[PDB]
């Protein structure tokens, strides 16, 4: 026998033996997350130890199967994932430093202490401290106290450690032969060995830059409108041809513009659609939310939930003495065990989150037939762009009438579409430049174009020209401002929040095209549509068996990421914004500074 059919025999044993140990880890984690107790921490640790040991042992043994003697793509894909060492290439001396560094960073981020000057009495930390302070307040000085308190302590205590965190993570990625740690991250999108569907690591950068060039007008108009409406909340301190100060953009870092809605309302005296009252007035329980989310997927094209999902899933908070960690999740334990852990009230946000979490489950059931190592989304953005277009169709003022919650005589005025479109633009269009800039900064730091002493200088120059945000008080080369964010201290990628945003609008316009929808895209509803569900399933069922380019083409008909559908969605708002900005300046001058 040759090498290929020997690898085929090896993978059979691996797939048989791996599914058994993955069920005990998931169930032990579920027991902890549903019922917190001291003795339910040891089982989780034991299961996690056994799973990790098995994975390491089988990864060691699978490196005696050279890839060059293999011609089938499926076995190559299954072997590549398992063969990857990771961080074990490091010497044991250089492996006791990196984990210690990461744990210290995580601990120092978790254990914060912000105390106001000349008063050691009260200290409020991040949750629910400064986060609540920088969520609802209209005082310049108070807002410019929490923004420098966090950067004064944490940054100055993460700069020395991060400098080491960079040097090791590169060398590891230099031992894995990838040029550096940024390209290691970009290797997720790589496709090789398929004609007409290949994709290189360096092409992702160029594909990202081109798209951002076709969103600048909309972001400039939104930025100018927000700036025009922020000169009245704070009578001054904002210049009409300048950059928005960092401590006046909702949350702390400026990652989301959502909390600026109370100050920026297109048409006041016209409230938005809320059906919480309707639910709470005519006896809506916690199951009817999950009984109507089923009849959506069943209506469109898709199978119904299993019996074990209706009896092994915690859908309502337990209360009493038993403790439960509330966070909406969707668990695939294997062996046909799907369940959802989330404590739900009777509101509208829970109703829309239910569709998200049920879409997550419905994506999992489709690729349960693939081998163990090929059960995931095509890339790191396919799995949260599928469970998110289901909340886009469960909130339109046509789905709600059809289920008996929005008055059957309701009228749709065009003074309310703009109000709904700014709520949806303060979250989607107002975060793309931040993600782009942060990931580009990390890419340059990892590559080496940014020397160690010009670190905080380049940060507050890309804030100027890419985002439009200015220092309220100048920072020298002693802070580490990006380290103040969660995904920079704890090692995580950050580009997945960009591409996903562009994917979810490519999908919808495709599905709405199969439903013969007429009118604005934002008013679409994929219900009772047997043509869109089949098209979505023809991508859901594959998993990681085929390149993400082919899976994307199966639904949208294009081989690359595109931004035009996102601009089509936000068209009326663009016209309104352009019409209401005939007496202002679009753009910002990168010279004005609050501290002069």
């Amino acid at each position: 026998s040759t090498i290929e059919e020997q690898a085929k025999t090896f993978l059979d044993k691996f797939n048989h033996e791996a599914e058994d140990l993955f069920y005990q880890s998931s169930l032990a984690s579920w027991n902890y997350n549903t019922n917190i107790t001291e003795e339910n921490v040891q089982n989780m640790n034991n299961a996690g130890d056994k799973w990790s040991a098995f994975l390491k042992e089988q990864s060691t043994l699978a490196q005696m199967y050279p890839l060059q003697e293999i011609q089938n793509l499926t076995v190559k894909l299954q072997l590549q994932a398992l063969q990857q060492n990771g961080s074990s290439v490091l010497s044991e001396d250089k492996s006791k430093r990196l984990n210690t560094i990461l744990n210290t960073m995580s601990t120092i981020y978790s254990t914060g202490k912000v105390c106001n000057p000349d008063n050691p009495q009260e200290c409020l930390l991040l949750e629910p401290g400064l986060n609540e302070i920088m969520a609802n307040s209209l005082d310049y000085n108070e807002r410019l106290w929490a923004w420098e308190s966090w950067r004064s302590e944490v940054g100055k205590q993460l700069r020395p450690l991060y400098e080491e965190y960079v040097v090791l993570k590169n060398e590891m990625a230099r031992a894995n032969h990838y040029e550096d740690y940024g390209d290691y991250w970009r290797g997720d999108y790589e496709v090789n060995g398929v004609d007409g569907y290949d994709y290189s690591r360096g092409q992702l950068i160029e594909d990202v830059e081109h798209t951002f060039e076709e969103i600048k007008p909309l972001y400039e108009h939104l930025h100018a409108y927000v700036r025009a409406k922020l000169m009245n909340a704070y009578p001054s301190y904002i210049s009409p041809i300048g950059c928005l100060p960092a401590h006046l953009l909702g949350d702390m870092w400026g990652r989301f513009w959502t909390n600026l809605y109370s100050l920026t309302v297109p048409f006041g005296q016209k409230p938005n659609i809320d059906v919480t009252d309707a639910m709470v007035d005519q006896a809506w329980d916690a199951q009817r939310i999950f009984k109507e989310a089923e009849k959506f997927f069943v209506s469109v094209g898709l199978p119904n939930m299993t019996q074990g999902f209706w009896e092994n899933s915690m859908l309502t908070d337990p209360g009493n003495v038993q403790k439960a960690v509330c966070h909406p999740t969707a668990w695939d334990l294997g062996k046909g065990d799907f369940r959802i852990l989330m404590c739900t009230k009777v509101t509208m946000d829970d109703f829309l989150t239910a569709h998200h979490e049920m879409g997550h489950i419905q994506y999992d059931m489709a690729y349960a037939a693939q081998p163990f190592l090929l059960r995931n989304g095509a890339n790191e953005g396919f799995h949260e762009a599928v469970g998110e277009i289901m909340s886009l169709s469960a909130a339109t003022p046509k789905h709600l009438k059809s289920i008996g919650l929005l008055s059957p005589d309701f009228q749709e005025d065009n003074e309310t579409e703009i109000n709904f479109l700014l709520k949806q633009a303060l979250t989607i269009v107002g975060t793309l430049p931040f993600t782009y800039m942060l990931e580009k900064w990390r890419w340059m730091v990892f590559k080496g174009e940014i020397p160690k002493d010009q670190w905080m200088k380049k940060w507050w120059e890309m804030k100027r020209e890419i985002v439009g945000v200015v220092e309220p008080v100048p920072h020298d080369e002693t802070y580490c401002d990006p380290a103040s964010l969660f995904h920079v201290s704890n090692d995580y990628s950050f580009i997945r929040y960009y591409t996903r945003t562009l994917y979810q609008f490519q999908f919808q316009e495709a599905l709405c095209q199969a439903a013969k929808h007429e009118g604005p895209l934002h008013k679409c509803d994929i219900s009772n549509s047997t043509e869109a569900g089949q098209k979505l399933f023809n991508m859901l069922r594959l998993g990681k068996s085929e390149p993400w380019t082919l899976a994307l083409e199966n639904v949208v008909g294009a081989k690359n990421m595109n931004v035009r559908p996102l601009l089509n969605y936000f068209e009326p708002l663009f016209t309104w914004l352009k019409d209401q900005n005939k007496n202002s300046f679009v753009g910002w001058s990168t010279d004005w500074s609050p501290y002069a």
Binding site: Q6, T9, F10, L61, G308, L333
Partner: protein, 195 residues
């Protein structure tokens, strides 16, 4: 009026593994095909070449009952002209089979929270099985070019594996008990007819 031992077959306390399936010989008795068709407690009841009713009054020489336990998704492989692990390495049916296949769920009996490791099946074999053949050998499968010497290792595996049933599994992974009934028609008095 001697009743055939159908209770000892369908109502056995413990069943057998697939690679060691149990065979029972039924002959010289009166067979009552009334607690099988009428009983609406069977998940799968399929007969090939013989109508279930009506044809329940035909004389046969010998009858065979083959019993084992598989999982839910594998029941479809107990049929002529089917491929898979169960059909090729465990239990093989001829193309011209004449008989019946019955399968029913047994979750409340064969599943345990800690896992039921008493049930086994064969994963590796040199060649496919001929029809109605049973192999209970335990020689190490030699996938490489080096001798295994009866010890597992690199490119040497133990041929038997366990199902590990648990109560919280899905329908397709739950245990199913399977009984296959075969009828023999030879140049014999055929003392098994049944009213």
């Amino acid at each position: 009026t001697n009743l055939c031992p159908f209770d000892e077959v369908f109502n056995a306390t413990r069943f057998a593994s697939v690679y060691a399936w149990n065979r029972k010989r039924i002959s010289n008795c009166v067979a009552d095909y009334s607690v099988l068709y009428n009983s609406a407690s069977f998940s799968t009841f399929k007969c090939y070449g013989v109508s279930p009713t009506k044809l329940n009054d035909l004389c046969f020489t010998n009858v065979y009952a083959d019993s084992f336990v598989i999982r839910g998704d594998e029941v479809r492989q107990i049929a002529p002209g089917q491929t898979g692990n169960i059909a090729d390495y465990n239990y093989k049916l001829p193309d011209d089979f004449t008989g019946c296949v019955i399968a029913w769920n047994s979750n409340k009996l064969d599943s345990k929270v800690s896992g039921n490791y008493n049930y086994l099946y064969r994963l590796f074999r040199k060649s496919n099985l001929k029809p109605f053949e049973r192999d209970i050998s335990t020689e190490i499968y030699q996938a490489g070019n080096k001798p295994c010497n009866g010890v597992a290792g690199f490119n040497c595996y133990f041929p038997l594996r366990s199902y590990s049933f648990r109560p919280t599994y899905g329908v397709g992974h739950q245990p199913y008990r399977v009984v296959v009934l075969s009828f023999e028609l030879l140049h014999a008095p055929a003392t098994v007819c049944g009213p």
